Amino acid sequence: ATFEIVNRCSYTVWAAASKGDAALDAGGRQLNSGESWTINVEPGTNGGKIWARTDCYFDDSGSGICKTGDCGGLLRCKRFGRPPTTLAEFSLNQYGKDYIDISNIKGFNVPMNFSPTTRGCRGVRCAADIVGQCPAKLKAPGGGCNDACTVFQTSEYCCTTGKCGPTEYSRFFKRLCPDAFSYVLDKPTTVTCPGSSNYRVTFCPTA
């Protein structure tokens, strides 16, 4: 499956793509404002994620740090990134279908649209200025808007006991971005696409 990753932000982002225990394709690349990077994701990839990283510094060997979404200091990500990170989430060829969503469960850093480029399903979008509107107690100094679980580490925010409900903090994410997961047990906003669909992830889709 092909994923075109497009940076529409006025600032440089370092795109990242991983399934948690491996990179997808090269795993990461710099995208200056306006740049597009096409990756290939193996069919059957379960629990894949794409995200943006901001304010990164890397030496010639691809080692450094990002202010948001840092993946163990690598340019080419092999693992998930340090929250807060807006997440494009996908599992491909799962009994013949693909499943896509955007999640704010691990906080928000950069707005995104995640859409098919092929027929037969809709895209998902979280384009609002969540960082600008972020509640004081969730603001990351590093940058971005933390999820409540990350900040407070309680059973209720983290959904440990398995029966969590919405909260003042989850409802903020949900108000700003109705079409993204705001907590673990949120009413799903996952879209069913034809198996082997192709996709575009756009950072700053309104911009």
Swiss-Prot record:
Localization terms from the record: Cytoplasmic vesicle
Asked if the keyword Signal belongs to this entry, the reply reads yes
Q: Which SUPFAM superfamilies match?
A: Osmotin, thaumatin-like protein
Instruction: Write out the entry's keywords from A to Z.
Output: Cytoplasmic vesicle, Disulfide bond, Signal, Taste-modifying protein
| Principal location listed in the UniProt entry | cytoplasm
Which residue pairs form cystines in this protein? C9-C204, C56-C66, C71-C77, C121-C193, C126-C177, C134-C145, C149-C158, C159-C164
In terms of InterPro entries, this protein maps to: Osmotin/thaumatin-like_sf, Thaumatin, Thaumatin_CS
An annotated GO cellular component: cytoplasmic vesicle
Its job:
Taste-modifying protein; intensely sweet-tasting. It is 100000 times sweeter than sucrose on a molar basis.
Belongs to which family?
A: Belongs to the thaumatin family.
Task: State the protein's name.
Answer: Thaumatin I
